[PDB]
Structure formats: structure tokens, C-alpha cells
Write an enzyme that holds these catalytic residues in place. Sequence first.
Site, mmCIF file in Angstrom:
data_model
loop_
_atom_site.group_PDB
_atom_site.id
_atom_site.type_symbol
_atom_site.label_atom_id
_atom_site.label_comp_id
_atom_site.label_asym_id
_atom_site.label_seq_id
_atom_site.Cartn_x
_atom_site.Cartn_y
_atom_site.Cartn_z
ATOM 1 N N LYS A 126 -9.892 41.546 -9.915
ATOM 2 C CA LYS A 126 -9.471 40.746 -8.770
ATOM 3 C C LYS A 126 -8.644 39.470 -9.509
ATOM 4 N N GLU A 134 -13.285 28.405 -11.289
ATOM 5 C CA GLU A 134 -12.197 29.206 -11.999
ATOM 6 C C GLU A 134 -12.746 29.248 -13.389
ATOM 7 N N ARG A 135 -12.271 30.571 -13.991
ATOM 8 C CA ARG A 135 -12.755 30.801 -15.215
ATOM 9 C C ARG A 135 -11.598 30.511 -16.359
#
Lengths: 501, 470, 469, 53
Positions: C157, C183-184
Site C-alpha cells: 500500500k 501513519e506508520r
Amino acid sequence: EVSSILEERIKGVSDEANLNETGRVLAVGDGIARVFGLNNIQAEELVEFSSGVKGMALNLEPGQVGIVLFGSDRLVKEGELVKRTGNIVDVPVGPGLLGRVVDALGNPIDGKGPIDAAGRSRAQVKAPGILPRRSVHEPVQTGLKAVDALVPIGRGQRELIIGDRQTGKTAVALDTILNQKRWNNGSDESKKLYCVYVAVGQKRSTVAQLVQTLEQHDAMKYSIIVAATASEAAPLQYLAPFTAASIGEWFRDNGKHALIVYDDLSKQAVAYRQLSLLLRRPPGREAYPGDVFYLHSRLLERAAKLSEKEGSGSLTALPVIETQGGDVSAYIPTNVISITDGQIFLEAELFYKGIRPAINVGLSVSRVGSAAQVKALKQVAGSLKLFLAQYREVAAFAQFGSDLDASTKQTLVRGERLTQLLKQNQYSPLATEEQVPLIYAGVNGHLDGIELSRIGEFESSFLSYLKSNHNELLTEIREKGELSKELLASLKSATESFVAT
Amino acid sequence: STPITGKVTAVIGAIVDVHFEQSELPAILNALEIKTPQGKLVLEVAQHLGENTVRTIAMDGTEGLVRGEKVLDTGGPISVPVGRETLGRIINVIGEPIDERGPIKSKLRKPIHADPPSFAEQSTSAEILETGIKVVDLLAPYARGGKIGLFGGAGVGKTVFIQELINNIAKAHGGFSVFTGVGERTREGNDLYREMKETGVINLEGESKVALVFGQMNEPPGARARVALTGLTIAEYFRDEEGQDVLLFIDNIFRFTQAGSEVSALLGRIPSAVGYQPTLATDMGLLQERITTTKKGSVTSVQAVYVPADDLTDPAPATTFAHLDATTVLSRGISELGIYPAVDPLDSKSRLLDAAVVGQEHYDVASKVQETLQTYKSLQDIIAILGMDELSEQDKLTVERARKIQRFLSQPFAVAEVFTGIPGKLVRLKDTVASFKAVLEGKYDNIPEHAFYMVGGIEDVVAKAEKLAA
Amino acid sequence: TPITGKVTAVIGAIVDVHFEQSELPAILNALEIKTPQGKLVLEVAQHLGENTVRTIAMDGTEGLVRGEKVLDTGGPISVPVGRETLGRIINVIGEPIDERGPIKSKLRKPIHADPPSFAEQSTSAEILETGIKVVDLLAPYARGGKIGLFGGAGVGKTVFIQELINNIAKAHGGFSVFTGVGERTREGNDLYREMKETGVINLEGESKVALVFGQMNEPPGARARVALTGLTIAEYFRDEEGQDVLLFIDNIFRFTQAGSEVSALLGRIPSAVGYQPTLATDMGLLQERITTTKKGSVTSVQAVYVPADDLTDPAPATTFAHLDATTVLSRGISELGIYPAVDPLDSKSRLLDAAVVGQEHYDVASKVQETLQTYKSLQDIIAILGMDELSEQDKLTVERARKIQRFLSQPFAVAEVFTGIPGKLVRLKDTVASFKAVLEGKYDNIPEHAFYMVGGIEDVVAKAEKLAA
Amino acid sequence: QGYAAEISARRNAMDNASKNAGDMINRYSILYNRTRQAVITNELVDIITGASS
């Protein structure tokens, strides 16, 4: 200019009268609130918040009366007083809603100025009696040759369009509305439809494309667009079918016919879920309310055909239920099926197969049988139903790789041609005059001499052939609406002269 | 108990709570009447919540209700009218006609809470109904005193089926019928009204041979529910005081079920498995138990049921399967193929299939019919996969006898002169048993399949042979 | 407002305050509770009556002493917008995370907006290309479009979205917003790096991007309002400047998800599937504040994370109504060695028609769907039997369908290293020619590995030689 | 000769089918069990929602 508009508005504002009710807000937020007091409050009545919000009232308690806000909840504060308007919810109805969009509450949102009002009506009117009703005989078509052909579409009946979200659910409805151009133009108003399209849970941009589509094809001049977009309040989405029905009912009273599209009831239900749980009262099956059935059933029995001591009107209904990743046995889907008198099931797989408009003839039923197909169209589709139902058993056996006799393969060869005939292009109106020739050919075995790929080439050409030569055949069909002895022969000869290509 | 005055406290839709003055309250199951700008609102008392607070189920449209609006007490339950003069007349939840005949002509009135007849009064059913419908007569015989069940899914020709039975049998008999409609459409009610005045069954001069109770879905979920109860009480007056056998009909009985589920939830009760009521068993039972053969008279229901998606792992249809003696399934498929009736007879089981009730000969003919057809259904997979392999002369002969039988199940009907235009035929019980016997023996294995298409008796097959010859 | 109160409760991130003054409060106000965290900023969402308000808490809930003083700001939180928000990353309350210090502005606006009307609507029917073969043919995008993506994450993704940024914002070049909801953090740094390298963010000038980052570490409340914060910036662009913008989100399922956690606490009874009863109202507003107006239009690319990879859940399902086009991505196809993993039978656009992106486009696209579908229907048969135990007409379809399947790939230019094949970019015009060609049978007569990990028709030919030697 | 080799092909194929079909049976059985179980859980969630109101 701007100075004048603002000064008129100051004149147009302020100066309230002596109040005869009160109650103090407490709980409040989510578009929803609860007030303490209020002993003159009616159920469904409109209460005027002093912030500029109006909220109808659906629950009363000897504690705290629950008035569901319409307006933005950010305006509303606690400890305010509210004043009962003293009238249950109503909309103006009149012939000034023609070629214009109006919202939940019946004011224009398309900026096309004030509507023309000849009455007011109320959103709850409910079904007419058994004696002021008569039976439905009233031909009507959708401009899809397939749908007309297989299931009996009427004026005054309710037929449920069911199947997966965004498979051109809306698009299926739009073909019918385009095709409702043909009767509207016709002089007689005992034919005319003033179609009302209700759109619930849809984004503003979806609605805005659709009105451009309608005007371009010159079909926006009898249509009404009622809206309640997905941002706009949980009451206002709930109120959108009921006020569409009152607009529809005014044509009915006058002795004119109209048609109501409820796209989607599934999203109306979702709104009511949000409302019912924030009045913290028990729901039914799968969090959807306990009185959700009461809503769909009451509404639906108001699109009814009238007897001849009345207008002799009939509002027609097409419900639309989008099943979320299928499921036909889900609580809102199950309830509506039971209420409707037919299904025009749309199947997702067949769409990729190239059978657009997509339908599946077994999942689509008619309990009382054919009684609203054009008589001409009944004669030609006579064995169409038997062929296609058979083709489905034969085809499944046929592709396995097994051995077949010539008898089984007459069904396969015959079916394949029939299915390919059904294919049509979306947003293309059609007439009885040009669906009678095509089904004749198909049933009477003149599409087997024509190859499968060129059945589509053939259709457009066969009807053109007739414009030059057998233009008499088409006229007889339009004028008499039936096929006699002579018309069968005439047509049997018309198919023969041009079978090529 | 006695007429008192209470004031409304809370309006929660259909649900309406009242707070009657101290030491004074109505008893459970009574009828309260509340003045409303829309007829007379009837409220059915269903609980006590302490300090003289009752909670009710609505029977008439709710709108414009003020908290504080006076509620009278009748002193007793909702009382309907019954009689041999309410036959043709239409009656609903509050006993008013909706085809505007004004106030019902009443001989007697009765309560809709009638406790079921006891085991002492019971009698054993020995009287045998004939429907004159061959597939029904042969493969699931009905007996008059029975509790027949028209299981089917959605849109399967149930109304058309009921329309033929009422048109034929009601006039035939010297008994009564009361046709009761629970939560069904105003398109159907208006069709059911129109078609049955025409045929001479319901007639304004003279005494009608089938009464109507139209309860429709625009009305409240509560109001819809106790329509079924309303019809039953008329049948009970007939059974008892008039001393006449009844040939009952109710339509569709899932509408009854669905309504109780809804109101279970609103009253605050905790729903059971797959969104069904916890009170599901007893509610069906109450109605079914009242409909029974006593030494007063019989009551014979014929009940349509809606079965979601031809599914019977769903609990509400499956519980109902117990109560009903001589089931039939109206499969969706049978209708589409052009075969009228829509009955699939390898899924219909009857308990009225003995072998000295209907004689040995009936049982045995139908047994061979069951096997003959089912071997053919069994061979369909075999042709599907294998091809023309693993067959025999014996199989070929069975396949052929079965396809002759398969197209020998269709019997046109007068009340489908509107669906296909093919008019009725009536086939006697003894006559069907004979005609089916002849085919099995293989004397009519020389007459083509389509020469059993839309026939009745044996005479009819021979005649349809000449047409195809000619 | 000079309304003061003390903290009655502190239950998770949903603090409740009780006002000692009779001056009455308003919904969608903000309160600051003086904390040893500097200050904590909270948002009234409910009034529960008796002047006991219920407030959403953005930052931490360690340190909040019970019966601790408040002062009521008296209104919504206003972020800072401008062209002086370009090349800055801003937190929900506004703070720099890239530490170029305080964010400058000419206009600071409330987070919330009131979604445009039917009157302010405008229409579009434009053709926008990413350059991706499968996206273009089967599901073409447009200018002002709202796009939807589905299936799980940590499967490509991020890369997929990175690649969409790499194409569309350099084929445009105007204003752009990146707003990242939950968000990572380790990835977020790769975007920062990636952008600076690729010339997007420029801090010795001003960037062609502005940014919003909210991490998934952060309390539910912050995660809900990362998205609204981002939208305020995009509206600035849409309206004040008068120019069309971009928006990318990875993932928007988080908006939904965070709101689900806070709901139980707030007073609300949550619906079945544990999803808030307010999904509809929140969705409705967001998707109509990204909308084609008379001024600009915010062309957006939205990434939904799906739980158990099921669409049968109400949160993903209710979104489809508001999307013009979808390109559903399923994890299994990503596993098979095919990138993009977008399903070709489970793709749709309302702009794929026979006069919208032209007639040739439609015929090609139609044929692929018909061919693949038949093949899908026969998958049982093909495996239980063989592939000459099929009927002859079908044998041609099956063989044809297999070539298309290996063909569908197009190595990514941002993950060129990880695939192990250089990044390929091809036109909408080049793509129509390439699919046309396969359907004509022109280069159908060559290995299935030849069509395996390559973009358009041209690359296929070049590889036959590679296998041949 | 042809005819024996034909019954032999027929034999190889219907034997293979039973194996391939076995593999598909095993795969929808894991799917079946799980889908039955998923439904019981979902019914419990519904009861909870009710009871809360």
C-alpha cells in the site's frame, strides 16, 4: 445591491410573541438532544430551538422529551428554551417543482428561485382504501428490452431492484426515467409522468452529474429531484421518502400518473439506526430499529392505482436496496422483499460477462403473473421465458466436455442467440414498436441463421430496413398495441426480407 | 376493570405508557380507548410496570399525541363482531370496514382472547377434504379437520393458489370460510376483493360463502398482529354456536410472526436466536390450538407461509413445520417451467397418508410415483457428468415414464385466465388415482409428454393426443 | 470564554469537566486544561446536562489530576494555513514535527467546515492518467475524481501510494497536500526522504507540497482529527488561491476506527460489528468537503485498510456510495508475483464509457472482462479435469485469459529495487495500443513467462529474446 | 487399440478428479467450519447491543 438585500432581511426578521410552552435543554450533541419539560408537545411536531435550529420530536417521556435536531449541533447550547412551532411537519406541493431540485424539507437547493405553491400537503397521508382503488393494467416500459420482456412492469405496482452497491444501481433507474420522455410529450396527461427521484446517502457530486444527464438528453422538464445527501441530518434522510411521496400524491389526486424512485432505502435505515440508538431505545435485528418495517411498509402502500370516483391516478414505486457485499437474507433486505410485489434482481457477475443491463431471471419473480406487459410484447415473449429457464439447465451440463445429443444442443444454440439479443447500451431509450420486431425474430428462429457476434450488428440494421420498406409494420404496432393474424404474417415476411448480416 | 381516567406519560412510537391514578389501573389484556384526530385509537395493555403504569401496543395510527391526553378503559378486552351476517363484510383490527360499508351488522360480539379448547373436547379427524388438484390429492392428501401448510418462498404463486381453492371449494360446500389477510398489500387486497365478487362466491344479495378480514401493512406492527386473532374468533362462532364446519384460510402467516418479533424488541424483551422472539413457540401454538376438531364443529386452516430464501435452517419457518399436518412446498422453479401448480411433490409430506384412510391403492400408486420421479432426478447428475454412460434400458424406461408424469402434474385454473388465459378443470379424488395408475402400468407410455400437458383426467390425455396428431 | 471549571473525571482519553459558573457552554468548543505537559487541548463533543461537559483529549492522559482548573478557550481549534505552510509538517494543533519552528500564516481557520451545497456544485468528466496499464483501461481516473483503494497494508500500500505521488504531483506541479491519518512512523520518514530527493519538498525555497502527519501511536482523539486538519489546508488551496489540488491518505479507515473507540465512552451505544452509529454522518461530511466546487476541486486518492479483508463490514461498504471510481486490491494476487495486485474483474469507474474515454477504450476493456470472467467460472473444471477436456471454443478463451493474467503487471519505479526489475511507465495511449494488440492475437504465440513482470506490449517482445537465449 | 487407450485415458482422468476434488473438499471444509463459527459470534454481538439499550 448588497446594502438593499441586507436591509430587507432586517425588516424580515425579529419580533416574537408571547410563548405558551418552554423547556430547558440538557443533553445535546450528535444532531440529537434531550430537553426537560414540554407537556403540549405532539409526536412528530416541530420545535424551534432559539439557536436557529429546528428539530422534530419523536420521543416523549415524563422525564426528558427527545427532540432530534435537524440543524448543526454546534449552534445549540444547553439551558436554552425551545418553542413549539405547533405544527407537525409539512411541505408545500405545487407544479413549481417541475425541472428543479428540492431537499428534505422541500425548499430548492439548486438556486432556481421560489417554488410555486398551489397547496400544502403532509408527509404522512397513508394508503387509500380498498373501494377507492382499482387494479393495474397500465402499460409502461423502462427502455430496457430485457426487463420489459421478462417481468410485467406496471403503473401503480411496486418492484424492488436489489443487488450489490455501485453496479450502476442508479444507472438502471436513469434508463427508465429517460424512457419516461416518450409518454410525457404525448398530449394526454392521463399518460404523462412527472417522475420524482429521491437520493439518500449519496454525495452532492453524484446528484450534480445526474441533473446534467437529464437536461442533456432533454428529459428534465417533468422530473423532480428530492435530495438528502449523506452529510445532512439523520432526521432529514428519514424525512426524504415521506415528503417525496406527498409530491407524488398531488399528481395522483389530480388524476395524473407519476413514478417514485427510492434509491437507497438501505441508507434511510442506517440513518434511523443512528437516531434510535441515540434515543437509546432497543432495536430489532442487526442494530436496525424495531419499527423500521413500519416505515417501509406504510410508505410503499401509498403508491397505488385509483378507481374512477377519485382522480384515477397512479403513483408507481421502485425501491432500491443495495446489499453490502451481497446478502438477501439481511434484515432490511428481507423486509422489503416481502412488501414488494415483484423483484427485478440485478446480478454482479453477469455484468463482466457482458450482459449489461444485468438481470437474473430466477431471482426475479412475479407472484401474480403477467398482467402489465404491452399485449403485442406479450405475444412475442411468449416462449422467451420457457427458453431461457431451460437454457440455464442445459448450459451447465453442456460445457463440462461430456457428450451431448442434437436435442440438448438445440437449447444451447437457441439460448445463446436469445441472451445476446437482450444486450443494450445504457442511457438509450427504446419503444414497443422497436422491441416487438426483435423478439419475434428471436422466438421464431431467424437469429440462428445469423452468427452470434453479428446479432448486435443485426438489430440496429433490421429496424432501419423497416424504416425504408416495412414502415407500415411499425406504425400498426404503435397504433394498435397488439398483433392480430395479419400483423404476424406481415412481420413473418418482414423478418425474411432481411435476415442477412 | 372499570372505566377510569389516566393521562399519557410517554410516547415511544407504537409503545405508549400511561400513568393511571393511585389504586386504579386496568387489568392485563384490556382495551383502552384514547381520543385522537384519527378514528378511535385503541391501546392494548401488555404490561404492568408498577405504581399504576401500564405499557401498551398500538392498534391505530400514531401521530399527534400529547402527554396528558385522557385514556378511558372499556373494562374488558378488544371486542370484535361475529355472526352469519358479517360474511362479505370486511373487518380489521378495530372491526371497521376499509371498503366503506360503515358499522358492521352484528348479531353477537366476542373477545379475541379466547383461551384454547381442552383435551376433553377433542375428536379424531376422519372427514376427508378434496381439493380437486391432482398433484395435491395424490401426493399429500388433505383431510377436512386438518392444519394444512402452504410452505413456499417469495413470489411463488401462493395468492393464485388460495384464489383457486376459495373459488371452488367454498361454493361447493354448505359450510363457511373466513378469509383472513395478515399484513399484505393493498394491490392484493383489491385483486382478492374484485375477483371473488365476480365468480359468485361473495355476492351482496344473499349470504356470502366466504367472509373477509383485511388487515394491511400500512397499519401498526401491533395492529397487524392481532388481525389474525380477529379472523379466528369469527371461525370459533361458526364452530360453536352455529355448529358448522369451517374451511379456514389465513394469508401470509410469516407476517404474523414477523410482527411479534418486532414488538418483543420494543417492549424491552431480549431477542432470541437469529433475531426471533423468545415467545415464538407459544404464539403459533395459541392460534393453531384454537383451530381444531371438537364435537362442536371443525375449523380447517389452510396457511400460506413465507420462508426466507427457500431456507429452513432459519428458526421461524422450522418451528412452524411442527404444527402443520399435511405440508406442501410451492417451489419457485416449478412455476417458471410453466407447470401450474408450483407444488414440488417430493418435498411435500403428509401424516394423512396411511393406507386404509385413503385405501391401500392410493398409497401404493403414489409410492411408485415418488420413486419413479426421484430416480429420474437422481439420473440428472449422472447424465450431467458421465454423459451417456452407466445407463440401461431400465433407466431409459424410468426416465421416459417420469417425464410423462412430470408434465402430468399441470392442471390449468380459472383464476389464471389472467395469468396465461387457460381456464379451469376439476379432477375428482378417485379419478386422479385411476389416471395415474394407468400411466404406471405403461398403457399410456405410447401417448407423448405434451399430451399430458394441461390435462385433468384420463379422457383429457387421449383427447390431447388427437390434437398433436391433427 | 471566562468559564472555569474543575475535572470531575478522567476516563481514558474522554475527560469530563464540571463548570462552576452558570454561564452556559456551546458544542464544538475547546478547553485547555493546564498540564505539566505544557497544556492539553481538548474538544467538547457533548453537553450531558447540569454543566457537566464531555471532552475529547488529543495528547497524553498521564498527569491529569482530578479537580484540576480549566479555562475555556470558547471555540474550535484553528490551525494555520497559507503558502507558509508549504515545506512544514503540522501536528493536529499545528506544531512542527520537522522543526523549522512556528508556522506562519495569514489566515488561521477552524478545523471543521460546512460541506458545499448543491448550488456550489460543478462537474467534471476529464481524463487523468497515472500511467498504470490496469488502472487506465479498466478504471480510468479524472481531474477532480475521488478514488478508493481497498485491501490490507504492509503488502505494497505504501509503495503503491508513493508511486501515485511520484506520477501525479510532477505531472501537475501545483499545490499539494499529503495528509497521513495514523501513519506508520518508520515509513513516514521514508516519505520525507523520498520527497526531498525527488525534488518535491524544498526548504531552501518553498515546496510544491504542504504536509500533515498524525501517527498511530497517538490517542484515539488525535487520530480522528488529523484528517480534518488536513482538509482545512486543502480547502485553502481550493478556495483562496483558486487552484486544483491533490490529496493522498494512507489510510482513511483510521478515521472510522478511532471514532469507534471514543464512541463507547461518549455516551453512544455502538451498532453491531462494534462500529459507531455516527459513521454515516462523519463520512458524509468528509467526502463532501472533498468535492468538485466552482472554484477548485480536490482530486483525492484514498487508501482503506480492511479488517480480515472483508467488504461485508459496514465501515468499508458505506464508503462506496461516495466514490466515482474504485480499484479493489486483494492480498492474494500481490502474493502471486503480480504487481499491481488490482483485481480486473473487481474494478469500476463511472468515467469508463464509450464516449467518455472513447469507444476503442471501452471495446478493449469489455473484452478483457468477458474473457477473464469465463475463465473464473471455469476454474473448478480446469483443475478437477484437464485443459483439453474442455469444449473447443472455451480452449481459446482459457488460453487467451492466461496471457492477459501474466501481462497485468507493471514494475514500480519507486520499488524498482525491491521487485528487481526497472520501473516502467507507459501512457494511457501506449496502454490502449498494448491491450488491443494482445486481443488481436499479434504476440499471442510466445511464453507465459514473457508476459510475466513487464509493463506494455513492447517490453514483452524484448524479453522473448532473453528467454530464447 | 484406440478403444483400450481411450478407456485408459477415461480411467486416468476420473481417478485424478477424485484426488483434485479431495483437495477442494478439504479447502471448503476449513472454510465451512470457520464461516459457521463466525456467525455464532456475530449473533452474540447483536444480543449485547439490545441489552445495553
